[PDB]
């Protein structure tokens, strides 16, 4: 029920709180590779 286009209006908000992870792969994984993605459209994986 949150939209990243609207959240972009809060200067402190970022798509992902897990330091070092791609905004396109904010999911706990055994490893922390910045090259790893998976989500196609940020609006869809933001929810």
């Amino acid at each position: 029920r949150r939209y990243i286009g609207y959240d972009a209006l809060k200067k402190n908000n970022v798509p992902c709180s897990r330091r070092g992870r791609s905004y396109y792969d904010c999911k706990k994984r055994r490893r922390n590779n910045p090259y790893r993605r998976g989500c196609s459209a940020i609006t869809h994986c933001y929810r």
Partner: protein, 324 residues
């Protein structure tokens, strides 16, 4: 020696750290760059036996410094997150050597001056966030030729027009809110593919809404509020089969709000307050639906609360603009 190049880059950057409130760079010492806080290593893309610095993430470290040319040595970096720091000045041109750049987030810093055009040089760029800085001047139209998924420009000091090239963008989200953009929304807006969310809040745009907006059938969020648009809502807006949030408040729209629009299937919040609408369908009336939120404050509607006075309304309502 590849990690030596990263070491020099990061030590040149730490020299430029004037204030580091959370002592984030405290452990930035010695040649083991991979153990530096905020530095993220990974196997090389073309060789998993080689170790490279692939990511930088200092989000929320509140660091006052600038980005020195030497950061151009971080040639394996594809992720650069420095949201909510106090990095000042300009983006060094040398960052064009970061050819794997994919997601670049300098939101909420102290950057200034012309659009950071070094971003146009990155062939793999997907996510560009420069919101909440002091970038200004014209927007490079070629930015919509890159295959960006996300373009955040809001809360800067950009000026002049929305480029005619906007229809080329493949972005799922674009924000222009809180700049000083002027002129019309281009008719090419209908050609944007993949578009889900577009935000224009608080600019100096005007003219009529182009009917081509109705082709954006995957849009969920269309916010045009706090501009200077005129004319009637185009009837083509019934093509917004997916829109959930639609905000036209604080403009100079006139005319009728029909159930062509108010009965769109996913539409749950429709704000059209502070305009000069002189009629609305019954299904547009706030308080009328338990599923759909409406807001019609300060228009020119009979038998509704908090409307504009008849004195203020008749001059405008009786001279509607011919969208032509």
């Amino acid at each position: 020696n590849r990690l030596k190049r990263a070491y020099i880059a990061l030590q040149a950057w730490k020299k430029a750290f004037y204030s580091d409130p959370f002592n984030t760079a405290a452990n930035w010492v010695g040649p083991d760059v991979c153990s530096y806080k905020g530095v993220f290593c990974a196997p090389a893309l073309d060789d998993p036996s080689v170790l490279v610095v692939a990511g930088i993430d200092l989000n929320h470290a509140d660091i006052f410094g600038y980005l020195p040319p030497e950061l151009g040595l971080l040639t394996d970096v594809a992720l650069f997150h420095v949201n909510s720091n106090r990095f000042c000045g300009v983006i060094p041109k040398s960052l064009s050597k970061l050819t794997l750049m994919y997601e670049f987030d300098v939101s909420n810093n102290r950057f200034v001056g012309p659009f950071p055009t070094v971003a146009l040089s990155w062939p793999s760029l997907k996510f560009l966030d420069i919101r909440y800085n002091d970038f200004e001047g014209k927007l490079p139209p070629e930015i919509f030729d890159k295959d960006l998924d996300a373009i955040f420009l809001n809360n800067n000091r950009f000026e002049s027009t929305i480029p005619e090239t906007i229809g080329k963008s493949t972005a799922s989200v674009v924000t222009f809110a809180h700049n000083k953009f002027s002129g019309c929304i281009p008719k090419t807006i209908g050609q944007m593919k993949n578009l889900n969310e577009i935000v224009f809040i608080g600019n100096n745009l005007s003219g009529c809404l182009p009917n081509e907006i109705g082709s954006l059938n995957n849009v969920t969020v269309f916010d045009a509020s706090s501009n200077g648009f005129v004319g009637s809502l185009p009837s083509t807006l019934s093509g917004l089969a997916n829109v959930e949030q639609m905000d036209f408040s604080y403009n100079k729209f006139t005319g009728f709000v029909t159930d062509n629009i108010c009965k769109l299937p996913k539409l749950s919040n429709f704000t059209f307050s502070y305009n000069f609408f002189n009629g609305e369908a019954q299904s547009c009336v706030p308080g009328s639906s338990q599923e759909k939120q409406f807001d019609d404050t300060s228009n020119c509607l009979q038998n509704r609360p908090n409307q504009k006075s008849a004195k203020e309304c008749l001059p405008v309502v009786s001279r509607p603009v011919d969208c032509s």
